[PDB]
């Protein structure tokens, strides 16, 4: 249900679930970079 | 093997513990006949015998070893400073020549 | 002798401030005000926007270095200590950007806040000047002049410290934020951005002291000179003036006459950052004598925008008051 | 960039990609920690960013496939109990248990898990029931005693669906007492102390060291290729130049000395420092100028 | 990768001074004199600009 | 208010107040040597003695050691009050010079 699948070769998102290997829309491009998330990570600024 | 192992070896008969480096030259420079100090330079004294754990007795303030127009503390008995459990010692034959030859030997 | 330092070709003599009662058989000043508030004075030099300079006259080294060390990192100022994260899409990230921002000087007076004990957001009541940073970059949409500079195809291709919009906590809204809340500099390259990236943050501007993490220093130039007083002995009047005006720094020694040969003695013996070639003419060095004097510990403080340097030096000299009388009961 | 460079540093092209910070430096003996090639590196320059690190590492969740039974569909923790949704087992993964691009995953949390049914069905006519209720889950968790930050997540899958999970576990371990330095002269000291800004000596202008060496690595190693690099640093910046000392050529000591003269220093580039600790001039002058300290691994 | 906002051993602020040299290297002073019209009168910040490699541009050339 | 700071240490006090090591907590060279200065500047003290013994600079064991008769609280406070007067008179002469 999420869309966390960017492709450094197809700037578009699928998250086609399991038993569908990777293929970025219309291509192989099996090089998914996965999006970051929305938690308010805290950094000591030192 | 904590207090007798360190300083005395049977393989050589020579100490292993020693001023590795700059302690050698820092202490040397102290000993140099030039260096004249201040009673205000009782500061550096006090990391030694007025100092960290297990040394805070007094120190007998080696006397004012000049009384000129300008009182001053020579550099040696600023090295030779401790004032708990008085002791006695002797030495000689440092690394220099012989004869009062700008003396850096027979301490 | 007694506060005339000497600068031999090999090493500096006369340097310990050897005037304490009972360390000189002249007389030593059981020291305070009457002999000390008469000799003391604070000249001023050039005063200006972020750089200040002045010449205290009559201190000795300990209190002067106490100032120096307090101005550097024993005086508090407003600077970020934490960075909340919202959609940090950008390039290198999360600890440099965190610390980049950690290094940006915010411009709120550090005398209308207090320290921060463990509170709600670690604390959210008085201290948290909270800064919002919402920078978006995209494609400048009218660039028929295709394949041009980044400055012309992008939009806010960089993240300057002018996008640091301030967020109000109902506490502050009426006292400071009329315009005296922005960071000092509206131009700092925090992180370049290329189409499709954004940044969004929250910037917890805690109090702090310089010892903690020196990003709390207000000052840059807290280190100084004594003051040189370069002498002359039966001078080298004539054409030697060329030598004793290129050895010393370019304004230091005048060159006045030729008939009245007059290698023109000292003109400005404070402009010389001691290049000291003069021991290598080998025929002059035995005329000049170099002497930085122990009275005038010439200061020159410069800030980082957080406060005017006068405010910083006054704050330091009063924090020494605080320290000295916090152990005096 | 290097700042006393060699005509062969350019030809490599790897002076567009320099490997070490370019550090202000004194030659100074602080107090018994410097001694056998050790370095009193001041803080307030570690603080201002002298010598970060960005140690990455790599976890590869080689998500196999098997002939009869299948890893194929079986991805996804997130039991989602009450405490840490569910627990420091599966606290920080994600909706799909795979990724977490930016969260300080800590000390043996889960970076990725997978129920691991590999051969729980016997390939022959064995047990019938193991049609994937027999997962002995095999977590992929490990880490060291500090927070990483998952920075990239990769589903890199070759033509066989043998799912990798490549991951950028970045750990910005900025220096501390013990870290490794080199010098460009086989002079590999270590951070003895880490002094604060206010205690380091300041010349007269306002410059206080980043690094400190003590002049005890030289006279018995005889790297005199370092008492000179600090001449063509401080003469190349004080003038804007960008100097060369190249093998069997270079730039001699005389022109550099005259450059230091022109912008106000010694022939020898030996500054006239006062001491922070007490506040009055060092008795013997103090070498300075830029070095190029590399920051090693290990 | 990016410009140190502070001269690691000085204190002075720096990051404000890289989009002036790329406009003062084309008024075409000598680098040693593009870094005198902006304030840097010490070792430190002269290092922190003369020595730095703006990998920002070349890296961002292919960021996505 | 110096209850958890000035941990004096006369235990085997040769003179009644001899080994008087004000272990000034949370302290650096800054006050340390300025105090050390003013203390050392009285013709009844023999050590100003300031030496931070720890690696971390928080406990400056100023080991003032007077000439035997006095306590050492008396100089300690003379010096602290003298530094009070000195720094306040410095500020008085200073901020009235910003009008230049």
Tab-separated table of C-alpha atoms in Angstrom, chain C residues 2-329:
chain	number	residue	atom	x	y	z
C	2	UNK	CA	60.591	45.192	35.849
C	3	UNK	CA	58.154	45.211	32.912
C	4	UNK	CA	60.322	45.746	29.875
C	5	UNK	CA	60.151	42.537	27.872
C	6	UNK	CA	63.139	41.920	25.589
C	7	UNK	CA	63.223	40.168	22.235
C	8	UNK	CA	66.676	38.665	21.744
C	9	UNK	CA	67.325	37.035	18.372
C	10	UNK	CA	67.009	33.609	20.030
C	11	UNK	CA	64.389	33.860	22.770
C	12	UNK	CA	62.275	36.265	24.781
C	13	UNK	CA	63.655	37.254	28.189
C	14	UNK	CA	61.890	39.010	31.087
C	15	UNK	CA	58.610	37.165	30.835
C	16	UNK	CA	56.918	36.141	34.071
C	17	UNK	CA	55.507	39.405	35.555
C	18	UNK	CA	58.100	39.179	38.324
C	19	UNK	CA	56.713	41.925	40.578
C	20	UNK	CA	55.068	40.439	43.675
C	21	UNK	CA	55.699	41.720	47.210
C	22	UNK	CA	58.741	39.759	48.284
C	23	UNK	CA	60.045	38.851	44.828
C	24	UNK	CA	61.959	42.085	44.191
C	25	UNK	CA	64.119	44.188	46.510
C	26	UNK	CA	62.952	47.464	45.000
C	27	UNK	CA	59.424	47.827	46.220
C	28	UNK	CA	56.378	45.771	45.237
C	29	UNK	CA	53.076	47.355	45.605
C	30	UNK	CA	50.890	45.581	48.109
C	31	UNK	CA	48.533	45.801	45.184
C	32	UNK	CA	45.266	47.614	44.902
C	33	UNK	CA	43.281	50.596	43.834
C	34	UNK	CA	45.136	53.751	44.891
C	35	UNK	CA	48.310	52.770	43.031
C	36	UNK	CA	46.181	50.857	40.506
C	37	UNK	CA	43.168	53.071	39.769
C	38	UNK	CA	45.496	56.020	39.180
C	39	UNK	CA	47.726	54.207	36.681
C	40	UNK	CA	44.812	52.425	35.012
C	41	UNK	CA	43.030	53.803	31.941
C	42	UNK	CA	41.328	52.351	28.871
C	43	UNK	CA	42.018	54.149	25.611
C	44	UNK	CA	39.849	53.322	22.589
C	45	UNK	CA	40.762	52.477	18.993
C	46	UNK	CA	38.328	52.596	16.057
C	47	UNK	CA	35.255	51.307	17.888
C	48	UNK	CA	33.614	49.959	14.815
C	49	UNK	CA	30.796	47.734	13.706
C	50	UNK	CA	32.067	44.273	14.560
C	51	UNK	CA	35.716	45.026	15.400
C	52	UNK	CA	36.882	46.858	18.502
C	53	UNK	CA	40.332	47.721	19.798
C	54	UNK	CA	41.611	49.369	22.969
C	55	UNK	CA	44.730	49.688	25.107
C	56	UNK	CA	44.355	48.931	28.802
C	57	UNK	CA	47.223	50.502	30.742
C	58	UNK	CA	48.367	49.107	34.065
C	59	UNK	CA	47.056	45.571	34.355
C	60	UNK	CA	49.383	42.634	34.605
C	61	UNK	CA	49.151	39.491	32.555
C	62	UNK	CA	46.812	37.428	34.717
C	63	UNK	CA	43.687	39.611	34.659
C	64	UNK	CA	44.205	40.461	30.980
C	65	UNK	CA	44.367	36.818	29.980
C	66	UNK	CA	41.375	36.261	32.254
C	67	UNK	CA	39.488	38.678	30.024
C	68	UNK	CA	40.751	36.948	26.855
C	69	UNK	CA	39.759	33.477	28.068
C	70	UNK	CA	36.359	34.686	29.243
C	71	UNK	CA	35.596	36.511	25.989
C	72	UNK	CA	36.383	33.393	23.951
C	73	UNK	CA	34.345	30.661	25.589
C	74	UNK	CA	33.323	31.679	29.128
C	75	UNK	CA	30.561	34.072	28.040
C	76	UNK	CA	27.163	32.838	26.794
C	77	UNK	CA	25.380	33.768	23.579
C	78	UNK	CA	22.443	32.634	21.461
C	79	UNK	CA	23.242	29.771	19.099
C	80	UNK	CA	21.491	26.598	18.016
C	81	UNK	CA	21.919	23.470	20.123
C	82	UNK	CA	19.399	21.173	18.439
C	83	UNK	CA	17.735	20.657	15.063
C	84	UNK	CA	14.353	18.978	14.548
C	85	UNK	CA	13.942	17.161	11.238
C	86	UNK	CA	11.106	17.425	8.700
C	87	UNK	CA	11.540	16.045	5.168
C	88	UNK	CA	15.300	16.511	4.815
C	89	UNK	CA	15.312	15.443	1.171
C	90	UNK	CA	18.544	17.277	0.396
C	91	UNK	CA	22.162	16.248	-0.165
C	92	UNK	CA	24.696	15.674	2.598
C	93	UNK	CA	22.757	15.908	5.661
C	94	UNK	CA	21.734	15.269	9.224
C	95	UNK	CA	25.042	16.070	10.937
C	96	UNK	CA	26.808	18.653	8.773
C	97	UNK	CA	23.658	20.631	8.003
C	98	UNK	CA	22.729	20.052	11.636
C	99	UNK	CA	26.111	21.445	12.609
C	100	UNK	CA	26.210	24.026	9.799
C	101	UNK	CA	23.064	25.566	11.282
C	102	UNK	CA	24.622	24.933	14.674
C	103	UNK	CA	27.289	27.364	13.517
C	104	UNK	CA	25.017	30.169	12.250
C	105	UNK	CA	25.011	33.203	14.595
C	106	UNK	CA	21.474	34.089	15.629
C	107	UNK	CA	21.166	37.699	16.757
C	108	UNK	CA	19.188	37.659	20.006
C	109	UNK	CA	20.643	39.299	23.096
C	110	UNK	CA	21.864	36.618	25.531
C	111	UNK	CA	20.748	38.608	28.574
C	112	UNK	CA	16.985	38.093	28.222
C	113	UNK	CA	16.989	34.275	28.464
C	114	UNK	CA	18.090	31.641	30.986
C	115	UNK	CA	19.638	28.182	30.894
C	116	UNK	CA	17.608	25.140	29.880
C	117	UNK	CA	16.868	22.369	32.374
C	118	UNK	CA	15.239	19.074	31.340
C	119	UNK	CA	11.773	20.156	30.197
C	120	UNK	CA	8.926	19.376	27.797
C	121	UNK	CA	10.955	19.495	24.562
C	122	UNK	CA	13.859	19.459	26.967
C	123	UNK	CA	12.117	22.822	27.468
C	124	UNK	CA	9.913	25.129	25.400
C	125	UNK	CA	9.008	28.058	27.657
C	126	UNK	CA	11.602	30.864	27.736
C	127	UNK	CA	14.696	29.803	25.767
C	128	UNK	CA	13.616	28.194	22.505
C	129	UNK	CA	13.993	30.810	19.884
C	130	UNK	CA	12.586	28.432	17.288
C	131	UNK	CA	13.545	28.919	13.645
C	132	UNK	CA	11.717	27.491	10.645
C	133	UNK	CA	13.687	26.695	7.483
C	134	UNK	CA	11.429	25.846	4.523
C	135	UNK	CA	13.542	25.995	1.361
C	136	UNK	CA	12.325	24.523	-1.917
C	137	UNK	CA	14.249	24.465	-5.187
C	138	UNK	CA	12.794	23.783	-8.614
C	139	UNK	CA	13.204	24.636	-12.286
C	140	UNK	CA	12.987	28.295	-13.230
C	141	UNK	CA	10.077	27.804	-15.646
C	142	UNK	CA	10.939	30.511	-18.215
C	143	UNK	CA	14.434	29.636	-19.450
C	144	UNK	CA	14.172	29.610	-23.246
C	145	UNK	CA	17.877	30.489	-22.950
C	146	UNK	CA	18.386	26.767	-22.438
C	147	UNK	CA	21.591	25.286	-20.985
C	148	UNK	CA	22.579	28.286	-18.883
C	149	UNK	CA	23.978	29.030	-15.424
C	150	UNK	CA	22.429	27.370	-12.368
C	151	UNK	CA	21.579	30.890	-11.176
C	152	UNK	CA	19.126	31.122	-14.100
C	153	UNK	CA	17.548	27.668	-14.500
C	154	UNK	CA	16.913	26.916	-10.803
C	155	UNK	CA	15.008	28.751	-8.053
C	156	UNK	CA	16.758	29.326	-4.714
C	157	UNK	CA	19.345	26.798	-5.876
C	158	UNK	CA	21.109	27.406	-2.547
C	159	UNK	CA	19.954	27.708	1.058
C	160	UNK	CA	21.167	30.989	2.467
C	161	UNK	CA	20.560	32.118	6.030
C	162	UNK	CA	17.834	34.377	4.745
C	163	UNK	CA	15.255	31.574	4.456
C	164	UNK	CA	15.449	31.064	8.251
C	165	UNK	CA	11.952	32.317	8.965
C	166	UNK	CA	11.216	32.740	12.660
C	167	UNK	CA	8.493	30.792	14.463
C	168	UNK	CA	6.740	32.483	17.405
C	169	UNK	CA	6.332	30.975	20.821
C	170	UNK	CA	3.644	33.132	22.425
C	171	UNK	CA	6.217	34.100	25.040
C	172	UNK	CA	8.436	36.197	22.774
C	173	UNK	CA	5.988	37.428	20.133
C	174	UNK	CA	5.762	41.010	21.403
C	175	UNK	CA	9.154	41.879	22.920
C	176	UNK	CA	11.922	40.854	20.504
C	177	UNK	CA	10.328	39.857	17.178
C	178	UNK	CA	9.949	43.232	15.502
C	179	UNK	CA	12.941	42.435	13.285
C	180	UNK	CA	15.774	41.920	15.781
C	181	UNK	CA	15.496	38.121	15.685
C	182	UNK	CA	16.974	37.124	12.316
C	183	UNK	CA	20.448	35.608	11.967
C	184	UNK	CA	23.205	38.174	11.609
C	185	UNK	CA	24.088	37.200	8.040
C	186	UNK	CA	21.520	36.827	5.262
C	187	UNK	CA	24.031	34.995	3.050
C	188	UNK	CA	25.559	31.627	4.028
C	189	UNK	CA	25.717	28.753	1.598
C	190	UNK	CA	24.228	26.164	3.962
C	191	UNK	CA	23.451	23.552	1.287
C	192	UNK	CA	22.943	23.778	-2.466
C	193	UNK	CA	19.706	22.334	-3.846
C	194	UNK	CA	18.905	20.886	-7.281
C	195	UNK	CA	15.401	20.430	-8.746
C	196	UNK	CA	13.149	18.148	-6.724
C	197	UNK	CA	14.695	18.599	-3.264
C	198	UNK	CA	13.470	20.493	-0.214
C	199	UNK	CA	14.419	21.030	3.421
C	200	UNK	CA	12.217	21.705	6.448
C	201	UNK	CA	13.505	21.991	9.996
C	202	UNK	CA	13.060	23.347	13.502
C	203	UNK	CA	15.950	25.004	15.240
C	204	UNK	CA	16.097	24.855	19.036
C	205	UNK	CA	18.184	27.911	19.937
C	206	UNK	CA	19.242	27.045	23.471
C	207	UNK	CA	21.483	29.130	25.665
C	208	UNK	CA	24.976	27.828	26.223
C	209	UNK	CA	28.513	28.648	27.267
C	210	UNK	CA	31.559	28.463	25.032
C	211	UNK	CA	33.188	25.659	27.010
C	212	UNK	CA	30.263	23.417	26.037
C	213	UNK	CA	30.839	23.475	22.276
C	214	UNK	CA	32.574	26.589	21.021
C	215	UNK	CA	29.809	27.399	18.527
C	216	UNK	CA	28.733	29.636	21.425
C	217	UNK	CA	31.678	31.978	21.052
C	218	UNK	CA	30.584	35.510	20.205
C	219	UNK	CA	34.154	36.643	19.566
C	220	UNK	CA	36.699	35.876	16.850
C	221	UNK	CA	39.713	38.073	17.766
C	222	UNK	CA	40.343	37.216	21.378
C	223	UNK	CA	44.147	37.172	21.223
C	224	UNK	CA	46.456	40.148	21.278
C	225	UNK	CA	49.844	41.882	21.535
C	226	UNK	CA	51.504	43.515	24.424
C	227	UNK	CA	52.729	46.743	22.798
C	228	UNK	CA	56.155	47.161	21.176
C	229	UNK	CA	58.472	49.937	22.311
C	230	UNK	CA	61.441	49.582	19.974
C	231	UNK	CA	64.394	51.683	21.091
C	232	UNK	CA	67.474	53.137	19.386
C	233	UNK	CA	70.977	53.811	20.699
C	234	UNK	CA	73.081	56.611	19.173
C	235	UNK	CA	71.308	56.211	15.856
C	236	UNK	CA	72.438	55.315	12.353
C	237	UNK	CA	71.455	58.711	10.935
C	238	UNK	CA	71.696	59.007	7.163
C	239	UNK	CA	71.000	56.462	4.435
C	240	UNK	CA	70.582	53.626	6.945
C	241	UNK	CA	67.056	55.049	7.293
C	242	UNK	CA	66.226	52.928	4.252
C	243	UNK	CA	67.226	49.832	6.224
C	244	UNK	CA	65.548	50.866	9.471
C	245	UNK	CA	62.420	51.577	7.521
C	246	UNK	CA	62.219	48.357	5.519
C	247	UNK	CA	63.281	46.077	8.392
C	248	UNK	CA	60.451	47.306	10.621
C	249	UNK	CA	56.883	47.377	9.389
C	250	UNK	CA	56.149	49.962	6.706
C	251	UNK	CA	54.842	52.762	8.926
C	252	UNK	CA	56.838	52.097	12.054
C	253	UNK	CA	59.954	54.251	11.585
C	254	UNK	CA	59.997	57.622	9.848
C	255	UNK	CA	62.593	58.654	7.273
C	256	UNK	CA	62.803	62.428	7.507
C	257	UNK	CA	66.036	64.139	6.466
C	258	UNK	CA	69.425	63.659	4.816
C	259	UNK	CA	71.365	66.833	5.669
C	260	UNK	CA	70.248	66.426	9.250
C	261	UNK	CA	70.916	62.749	8.582
C	262	UNK	CA	68.409	61.698	11.267
C	263	UNK	CA	67.309	58.151	10.709
C	264	UNK	CA	63.970	59.387	11.887
C	265	UNK	CA	63.213	57.697	15.185
C	266	UNK	CA	60.024	55.878	16.107
C	267	UNK	CA	56.897	56.906	14.187
C	268	UNK	CA	54.233	54.400	15.196
C	269	UNK	CA	55.688	51.549	17.296
C	270	UNK	CA	52.409	49.646	17.374
C	271	UNK	CA	51.901	48.816	13.674
C	272	UNK	CA	54.699	46.228	13.587
C	273	UNK	CA	53.660	42.602	13.617
C	274	UNK	CA	57.285	41.673	14.383
C	275	UNK	CA	58.660	40.358	11.147
C	276	UNK	CA	62.074	40.845	12.840
C	277	UNK	CA	64.540	40.878	10.000
C	278	UNK	CA	66.585	43.372	12.006
C	279	UNK	CA	68.735	40.681	13.604
C	280	UNK	CA	69.903	39.677	10.110
C	281	UNK	CA	71.486	42.912	8.939
C	282	UNK	CA	74.321	41.884	11.301
C	283	UNK	CA	75.512	45.521	11.478
C	284	UNK	CA	72.319	47.176	12.814
C	285	UNK	CA	70.945	44.654	15.335
C	286	UNK	CA	73.524	45.974	17.823
C	287	UNK	CA	71.846	49.398	17.699
C	288	UNK	CA	68.119	48.733	17.921
C	289	UNK	CA	66.746	47.030	21.008
C	290	UNK	CA	63.301	45.451	20.823
C	291	UNK	CA	60.965	45.775	23.793
C	292	UNK	CA	57.287	44.959	24.007
C	293	UNK	CA	56.194	46.663	27.244
C	294	UNK	CA	54.157	45.007	30.014
C	295	UNK	CA	51.690	47.810	30.738
C	296	UNK	CA	49.611	48.301	27.590
C	297	UNK	CA	48.064	44.920	26.825
C	298	UNK	CA	46.502	46.314	23.652
C	299	UNK	CA	43.218	44.496	23.060
C	300	UNK	CA	41.351	44.044	19.790
C	301	UNK	CA	38.058	42.149	20.057
C	302	UNK	CA	35.776	41.389	17.139
C	303	UNK	CA	32.349	39.797	17.441
C	304	UNK	CA	30.310	37.464	15.237
C	305	UNK	CA	27.289	39.727	14.926
C	306	UNK	CA	25.536	38.373	18.027
C	307	UNK	CA	26.441	41.450	20.067
C	308	UNK	CA	28.423	44.650	19.591
C	309	UNK	CA	31.970	44.135	20.889
C	310	UNK	CA	31.381	46.638	23.694
C	311	UNK	CA	28.547	44.449	24.958
C	312	UNK	CA	30.852	41.429	24.767
C	313	UNK	CA	33.759	42.970	26.677
C	314	UNK	CA	31.401	44.410	29.299
C	315	UNK	CA	29.747	41.000	29.639
C	316	UNK	CA	33.146	39.343	30.088
C	317	UNK	CA	34.411	41.810	32.672
C	318	UNK	CA	31.147	41.344	34.592
C	319	UNK	CA	31.209	37.547	34.353
C	320	UNK	CA	34.587	37.774	36.056
C	321	UNK	CA	32.813	39.745	38.794
C	322	UNK	CA	30.273	36.940	39.032
C	323	UNK	CA	32.946	34.259	39.300
C	324	UNK	CA	35.037	36.188	41.818
C	325	UNK	CA	32.180	36.945	44.211
C	326	UNK	CA	30.515	33.566	43.812
C	327	UNK	CA	33.285	32.110	46.004
C	328	UNK	CA	33.364	35.032	48.456
C	329	UNK	CA	30.858	34.232	51.196
